[PDB]
């Protein structure tokens, strides 16, 4: 047993490692559809920019769970980064729809493993979610929901022009 | 008992006074309303929110500014419940600028029986600070608010989504 | 119909956070109320009134952002009239504090209601919002207001007017 | 007749010289609050630095009086300056209560001037005396109001002490 483990249950730490992975799942599907939107029969390079970002902001959430594990004593055990449902995300409203949905698997999952935390009575656990999860995963969820909206506003995925409108005044500053 | 500062200023003008803090509190109130409608996220125009919102803090200027004329003429302020608005759904920009350009028009024509009323009472202190404060802005805000309706009509506006998208973008994107 | 971001945010969460924006609005009202009241020829205590200005400011702050956390988690925001404060009056700033300890004593109360609702709700991100946001800033009005209250008795208030004059010149000054 | 001279009543000239009188007036009732406040037996330093700030003030009132008047084409016609009602002011809270009456004083005359500018169609002159004369009697109304209210719930003028922290810390 670690020397710094203390009042941390080993159900939490098997969430924290499934966790780590679905983060690094979310990483690899932003990945995709960035270049996706990089292709030259897509060409929406804000779309792609803002992909990527997200998927590096990914990599950030795992690698922070990462170095809570190791704060609690817990041990990392990594498993298969599975790949993407899609090859093809069809268009930027469409790339948008599964990423509200993936960040409410994500949002999701983490409500489960505070409620866990919860359980367990592990405060410290709980407060790590809440203050570097919860309200991010609230503000993504709500900023994909203002894109779906507009888009579908806008008129897309049907209007070619809406899409590159989006991408060039709401993607593209 | 009097105030000591109190001189030329007429009961009726402080009623009057009163009710027009009233007025430009609700004006807040609906612009506060308006913001927040467009913070939605199944109606996600953040320039609609932005413009509101600013609107909103301005109508509070006018409301305080109105206050402290109070207590400068020796009148007493006196509070009534603020009214919710008429509308919890805004439709859209284009609904939105026009409820706004008719609450500016109501505001106006208190405004000017206000100034009539002061006139009236030969208050000419209370009729230049109508003058100076309010007349004037409340002449641009109704001139920009039918811009922006004009504007939002001829961009095709409500049917059209792309309309309210550009206009949010291009004009009050600033 | 369901927001498309809502996710873990009940009902009884959106009705409480509706009447705490309500709640927060009226304690903006309140202290505009006082505000001006010690802007008053035969009150002129300039800095019992920036002070109760700034108040109204700070809880229409409070209000704005319990409106956004509402459009975030999906809710709808449903405004209710702005009810006028219980004084036209406000007699002292000694008063003035009381009423405004009183009034913010009510406030933090309803505050923690809405906690415990988010708590057995298993709602972590409303609780970590209130937690965040409101909890403390309440504790240290409710300590900062009861201070202000102790000096004002401990120097004579309200029947002593040389008591407030200073009060108003050295600490809100 | 002026040259320059447009729908200027005779009246408002007679008005506005008088007006300037006024002024003139005011200013040294505040002159001789001023240099009371400076007696070695009052010794209030931020009492008199007060009174003669207000003076200088009512100065440039008269002064952009008289300007007005050769502006419209009148002709300026000065009147003795008459001495204050008072070589003691007894404290600065009756120094206060006198420049608040000398005060609304002035500004009924003022209010005087401009019903009649309304009433002679002269809108140039209403709204010179809206601009420049009628908020800042207001303002000045309502200083003179609070400095009063301050001074009589701190004790005054009673105490001693009471004129003394006012001095320092509203006046200083
Ligand atoms: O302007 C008017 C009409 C009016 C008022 C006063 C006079 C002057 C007068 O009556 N002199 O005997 C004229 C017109 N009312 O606001
Ligand atoms: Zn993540
Ligand atoms: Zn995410
Ligand atoms: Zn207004
Ligand atoms: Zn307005
Ligand atoms: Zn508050
Ligand atoms: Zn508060
Ligand atoms: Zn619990
Ligand atoms: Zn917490
Ligand atoms: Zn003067
Ligand atoms: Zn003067
Ligand atoms: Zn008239
Ligand atoms: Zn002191």
Same mark, same amino acid.
Do not use: C
């Given at each position: 047993? !670690? ?7 080993? /159900? !939490? ?11 690094? %799942?979310?990483?690899?599907?932003? =990945? !995709?559809?960035? %270049? ?29 769970? #990462? $170095? ?19 090859? @093809?995300?069809? !268009?930027? =409203?469409?790339? #948008? ?15 489960? *493993?505070?409620? *866990?935390?919860?359980? $367990?009575? /592990?405060?410290? =656990?709980? @407060? ?32 070619? *022009? ?12």
């Amino acid at each position: 047993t !670690s020397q710094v483990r203390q009042n941390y249950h080993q /159900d !939490s730490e098997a969430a924290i490692n499934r966790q780590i992975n679905l983060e690094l %799942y979310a990483s690899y599907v932003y =990945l !995709s559809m960035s %270049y996706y939107f990089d292709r030259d029969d897509v060409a929406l390079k804000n779309f792609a920019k803002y992909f990527l970002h997200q998927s590096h902001e990914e990599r950030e959430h795992a690698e922070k769970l #990462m $170095k809570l594990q190791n704060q609690r004593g817990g041990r990392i055990f990594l498993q298969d980064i599975q790949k993407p449902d899609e090859d @093809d995300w069809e !268009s930027g =409203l469409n790339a #948008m729809e599964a990423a509200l949905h993936l960040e409410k698997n994500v949002n999701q999952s983490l409500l489960e *493993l505070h409620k *866990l935390a919860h359980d $367990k009575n /592990d405060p410290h =656990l709980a @407060d790590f979610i809440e203050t570097h999860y919860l309200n991010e995963q609230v503000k993504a969820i709500k900023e994909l929901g203002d894109h779906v909206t507009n888009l579908r506003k806008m008129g897309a995925p049907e209007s070619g *022009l809406a899409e590159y409108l989006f991408d060039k005044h709401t993607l593209g500053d």
